[PDB]
Amino acid sequence: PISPIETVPVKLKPGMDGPKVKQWPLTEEKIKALVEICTEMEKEGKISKIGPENPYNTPVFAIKKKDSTKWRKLVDFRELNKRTQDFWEVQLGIPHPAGLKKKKSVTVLDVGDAYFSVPLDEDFRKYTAFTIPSINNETPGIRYQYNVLPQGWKGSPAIFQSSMTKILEPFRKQNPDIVIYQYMDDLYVGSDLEIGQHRTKIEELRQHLLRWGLTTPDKKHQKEPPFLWMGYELHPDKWTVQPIVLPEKDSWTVNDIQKLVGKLNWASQIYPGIKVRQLCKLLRGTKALTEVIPLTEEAELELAENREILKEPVHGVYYDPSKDLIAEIQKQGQGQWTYQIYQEPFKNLKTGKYARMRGAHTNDVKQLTEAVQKITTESIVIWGKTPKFKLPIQKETWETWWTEYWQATWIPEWEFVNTPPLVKLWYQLEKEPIVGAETFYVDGAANRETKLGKAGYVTNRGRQKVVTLTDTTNQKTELQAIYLALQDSGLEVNIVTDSQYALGIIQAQPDQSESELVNQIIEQLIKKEKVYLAWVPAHKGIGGNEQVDKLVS
Amino acid sequence: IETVPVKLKPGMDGPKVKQWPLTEEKIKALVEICTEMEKEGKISKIGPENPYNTPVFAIKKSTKWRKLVDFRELNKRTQDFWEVQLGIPHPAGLKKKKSVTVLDVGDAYFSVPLDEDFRKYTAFTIPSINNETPGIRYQYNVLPQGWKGSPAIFQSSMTKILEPFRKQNPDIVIYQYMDDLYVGSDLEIGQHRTKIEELRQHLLRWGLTYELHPDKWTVQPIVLPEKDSWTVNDIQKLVGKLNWASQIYPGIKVRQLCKLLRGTKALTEVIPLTEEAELELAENREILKEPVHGVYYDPSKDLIAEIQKQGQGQWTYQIYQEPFKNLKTGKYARHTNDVKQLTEAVQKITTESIVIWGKTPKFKLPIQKETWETWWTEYWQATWIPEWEFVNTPPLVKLWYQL
Numbered sequence: 022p023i024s025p026i027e028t029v030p031v032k033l034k035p036g037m038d039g040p041k042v043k044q045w046p047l048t049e050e051k052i053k054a055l056v057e058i059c060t061e062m063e064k065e066g067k068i069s070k071i072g073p074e075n076p077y078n079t080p081v082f083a084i085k086k087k088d089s090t091k092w093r094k095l096v097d098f099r100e101l102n103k104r105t106q107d108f109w110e111v112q113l114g115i116p117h118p119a120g121l122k123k124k125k126s127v128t129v130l131d132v133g134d135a136y137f138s139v140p141l142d143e144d145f146r147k148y149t150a151f152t153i154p155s156i157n158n159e160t161p162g163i164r165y166q167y168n169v170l171p172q173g174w175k176g177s178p179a180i181f182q183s184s185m186t187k188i189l190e191p192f193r194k195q196n197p198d199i200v201i202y203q204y205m206d207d208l209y210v211g212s213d214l215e216i217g218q219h220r221t222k223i224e225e226l227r228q229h230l231l232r233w234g235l236t237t238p239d240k241k242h243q244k245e246p247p248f249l250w251m252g253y254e255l256h257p258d259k260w261t262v263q264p265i266v267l268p269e270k271d272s273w274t275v276n277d278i279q280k281l282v283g284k285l286n287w288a289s290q291i292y293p294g295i296k297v298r299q300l301c302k303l304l305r306g307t308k309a310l311t312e313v314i315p316l317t318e319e320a321e322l323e324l325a326e327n328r329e330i331l332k333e334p335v336h337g338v339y340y341d342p343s344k345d346l347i348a349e350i351q352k353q354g355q356g357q358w359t360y361q362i363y364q365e366p367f368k369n370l371k372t373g374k375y376a377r378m379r380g381a382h383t384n385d386v387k388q389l390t391e392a393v394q395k396i397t398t399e400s401i402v403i404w405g406k407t408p409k410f411k412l413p414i415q416k417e418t419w420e421t422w423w424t425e426y427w428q429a430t431w432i433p434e435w436e437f438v439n440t441p442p443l444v445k446l447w448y449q450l451e452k453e454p455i456v457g458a459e460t461f462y463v464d465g466a467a468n469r470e471t472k473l474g475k476a477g478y479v480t481n482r483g484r485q486k487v488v489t490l491t492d493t494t495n496q497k498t499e500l501q502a503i504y505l506a507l508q509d510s511g512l513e514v515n516i517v518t519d520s521q522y523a524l525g526i527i528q529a530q531p532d533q534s535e536s537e538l539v540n541q542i543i544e545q546l547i548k549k550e551k552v553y554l555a556w557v558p559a560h561k562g563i564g565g566n567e568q569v570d571k572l573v574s
Numbered sequence: 575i576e577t578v579p580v581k582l583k584p585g586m587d588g589p590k591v592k593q594w595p596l597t598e599e600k601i602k603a604l605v606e607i608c609t610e611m612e613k614e615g616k617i618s619k620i621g622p623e624n625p626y627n628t629p630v631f632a633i634k635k636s637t638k639w640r641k642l643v644d645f646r647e648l649n650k651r652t653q654d655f656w657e658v659q660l661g662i663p664h665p666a667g668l669k670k671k672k673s674v675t676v677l678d679v680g681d682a683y684f685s686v687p688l689d690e691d692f693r694k695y696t697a698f699t700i701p702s703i704n705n706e707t708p709g710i711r712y713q714y715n716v717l718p719q720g721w722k723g724s725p726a727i728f729q730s731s732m733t734k735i736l737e738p739f740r741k742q743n744p745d746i747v748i749y750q751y752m753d754d755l756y757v758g759s760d761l762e763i764g765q766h767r768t769k770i771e772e773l774r775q776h777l778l779r780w781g782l783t784y785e786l787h788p789d790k791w792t793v794q795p796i797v798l799p800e801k802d803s804w805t806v807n808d809i810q811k812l813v814g815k816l817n818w819a820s821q822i823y824p825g826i827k828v829r830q831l832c833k834l835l836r837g838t839k840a841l842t843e844v845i846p847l848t849e850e851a852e853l854e855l856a857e858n859r860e861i862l863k864e865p866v867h868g869v870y871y872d873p874s875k876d877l878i879a880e881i882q883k884q885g886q887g888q889w890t891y892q893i894y895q896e897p898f899k900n901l902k903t904g905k906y907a908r909h910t911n912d913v914k915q916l917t918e919a920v921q922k923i924t925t926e927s928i929v930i931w932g933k934t935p936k937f938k939l940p941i942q943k944e945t946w947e948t949w950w951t952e953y954w955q956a957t958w959i960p961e962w963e964f965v966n967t968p969p970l971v972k973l974w975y976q977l
């Protein structure tokens with residue numbers, strides 16, 4: 022049928038006019054097939070015969086469907102689409118299984134001929150004109166225009182969805198007890214009535230859909246659980262991802278490793294503790310998909326650890342709105358984090374992974390807070406409320422951090438949980454200068470064109486030491502000078518620098534870095550008893566700064 | 575009533591800012607609110623043929639949820655209309671007043687119809703949890719709150735409403751900014767408050783149902799300690815701070831002081847102060863107390879604001895148009911909640927900014943984008959929203975503005 026629902030007014034982009042492409046001449050079998058299709062469509066109202074004056078045209082083609090002897094009408098809307106107005110996004114975000122409430126009864130209803138079942142703005146139809154060419158194009162062709170939403174036109178998915186929304190609206194007002202998800206040309210319907218009163222509410226729905234143009238499957242043609250949907254397996258009171266098979270291979274190609282990582286990432290939605298750091302490392306660099314990459318030993322270990330987790334099947338449960346959400350996070354290692362969200366321990370709604378580095382240098386407290394933040398956003402999306410957290414960090418460790426760090430922060434309600442490795446601070450710079458501790462006035466300096474560098478220091482006990490660095494930046498030398506003062510000093514040491522850059526880095530208490538130097542400074546700062554770091558203005562003739570500044574050049 | 579044609583700035587198109595995820599309780603509050611405004615004909619449900627979108631949020635003022643539409647983009651895109659075509663003049667006498675009361679007159683706007691051809695640009699979306707349904711989409715049929723066009727358009731009705739009250743109190747300064755009325759006088763506080771009630775009654779006959787003290791507003795000068803014995807470290811921190819000042823305040827001198835830091839000395843060492851250093855130090859403290867020489871407000875330029883977290887519930891801020899040329903610097907203090915405080919400091923700063931310049935600053939915020947994105951709404955009470963970005967504070971700057 023074609024829905025009686027009022028049409029959505031459509032227009033072209035303001036500067037523009039509708040397409041006027043020329044019809045490519047087509048073979049005889051194709052012209053035949055197109056005529057057969059169009060005549061059938063025309064008799065259902067889908068399209069109408071026109072003749073010029075209508076100036077517009079969009080090319081039509083016919084393809085031979087798979088191996089079968091069926092033909093299909095393909096229309097190339099490229100130009101009309103470029104000239105058609107933008108619409109609002111159809112649906113931004115898709116439901117996650119973990120967010121569904123458990124239902125006593127669920128039914129899937131797919132709309133038949135969804136697009137062709139919805140009218141097109143009368144005033145817009147004329148821009149959809151296409152022409153079936155005569156044999157070798159010797160005579161005038163047969164011209165139609167759409168009365169309904171064309172396949173492949175820009176506005177179709179959006180106008181359809183809004184039509185379904187308007188049509189569904191009343192049944193929703195009258196049936197709050199009933200849940201309906203709109204996805205594409207599907208309806209998913211659930212309630213907590215017993216079979217009978219549900220089977221009954223369905224038919225009402227269907228019948229309402231029918232008054233409105235939309236045909237739907239009958240009791241006998243409704244699919245049964247488990248439903249497979251967008252990569253998931255949806256059972257009556259649980260869900261999981263669709264079955265994942267890690268390929269056995271002697272030799273892995275880029276393409277194979279990419280697909281493997283994608284499957285792992287997908288699996289990590291509900292399989293706890295999936296990791297892909299060591300695999301992703303392989304993907305770094307620039308190669309073709311066809312290239313074989315030898316698995317490193319750590320990647321080989323990783324695939325193995327994943328292989329075992331995937332061994333026995335896991336599932337997630339659905340959301341009970343009357344209980345709180347709890348989220349647990351664990352450190353999995355080098356910048357890697359995993360989490361689980363449950364309501365009853367330890368039956369997970371879902372699980373997940375966090376890796377991203379924010380900057381070149383951070384520490385676990387920063388990283389853990391980034392993961393709390395990422396999990397909070399996701400939980401608001403899926404459930405509409407923030408979880409209660411259980412974190413591998415003492416409350417006192419976290420408050421020491423927050424109070425003395427310069428960036429503001431605030432994680433929602435959380436508790437300590439003793440699930441090592443725990444996140445801790447690995448050193449703390451002194452807050453005051455250390456009496457009886459040797460003061461190193463350090464400095465670095467590189468020549469811009471040469472790339473030659475020289476890092477040194479001077480102390481108040483008269484020590485001095487300069488070293489040369491090759492192919493170094495004006496700011497690498499400033500870190501070297503600090504590393505230098507760290508390894509020649511005692512367990513207590515004050516260091517004076519004029520590098521805000523170096524100061525900024527160290528003052529944030531990094532415990533990991535992309536930089537080898539910074540990784541070395543860190544190992545040092547941990548070995549120490551007390552380090553106090555101070556900053557001075559360069560070239561102001563201040564104290565020992567003048568001296569070590571002279572030594573480097 | 576006859577509507578006012580509204581033109582976007584030529585070329586550029588309307589807003590298409592995505593909606594942020596909202597919690598269930600805020601969504602529900604928004605549905606109620608919007609179902610009611612639709613009954614009252616202020617908004618209407620819209621189709622997919624409307625490409626545009628601006629964000630909406632719910633704030634809690636009172637224990638009544640309120641709707642806050644984020645028109646930052648639209649305003650930026652309509653700026654020719656509300657600023658150059660129908661600009662509202664900012665009184666310089668406002669900031670001189672003993673007391674300023676801020677009144678919300680946003681209800682005024684719901685009675686004036688919005689230009690038919692402009693309505694599509696006010697589109698917004700109420701989201702749904704887990705994307706169960708498509709958003710609920712509306713646009714405005716009347717002057718929306720949050721849009722800088724609404725006061726621009728409504729102003730001449732505002733002038734009529736206020737004309738008697740102005741005539742009768744010629745020394746009272748009234749300034750409209752967005753959804754707000756700013757009312758300043760020099761009266762004693764009881765009389766000032768009496769005058770505000772009198773004003774409310776005027777407003778009340780036209781369907782329009784806290785105290786600032788701008789005098790009390792004074793610099794947060796960069797403060798040079800007054801110390802007992804000075805260490806090398808202490809003088810080093812003093813030079814660094816004065817070296818910062820010298821980018822800003824003409825006349826700052828450092829020679830006499832750093833003469834003290836001679837050789838390669840231990841940081842903890844106590845070094846006595848020169849006759850000259852102490853004079854220099856004194857002459858510099860004079861300079862920091864006063865306003866910056868050479869820095870002036872350019873009305874064509876944007877205002878910027880930086881905030882440093884000082885710890886212990888203290889927060890410093892500076893306002894400028896070009897970096898380091900400070901028009902104002904200040905302090906806000908006193909939650910063990912960093913985001914709650916930061917939120918307070920931004921609203922306070924914005925408010926002072928509106929009183930002084932008639933402009934909202936763009937903020938440089940010392941916080942991770944996503945954290946702020948998730949939480950600012952829990953504590954926000956203002957009806958406008960400044961522009962902001964997110965910054966890592968240089969550890970130096972924070973130290974130079976400490977107290």
Ligand SMILES: CCn1c(C(=O)c2cc(C)cc(C#N)c2)c(C(C)C)c(=O)[nH]c1=O
Binds near residue numbers: 127209246255
């Ligand atoms: C059984 C899974 N389920 C479902 C559901 O059956 C469903 C859900 C989606 C998103 C897609 C598909 C398909 N194909 C099916 C719903 C429905 C009524 C939303 C619900 O409420 N609660 C729920 O546990």
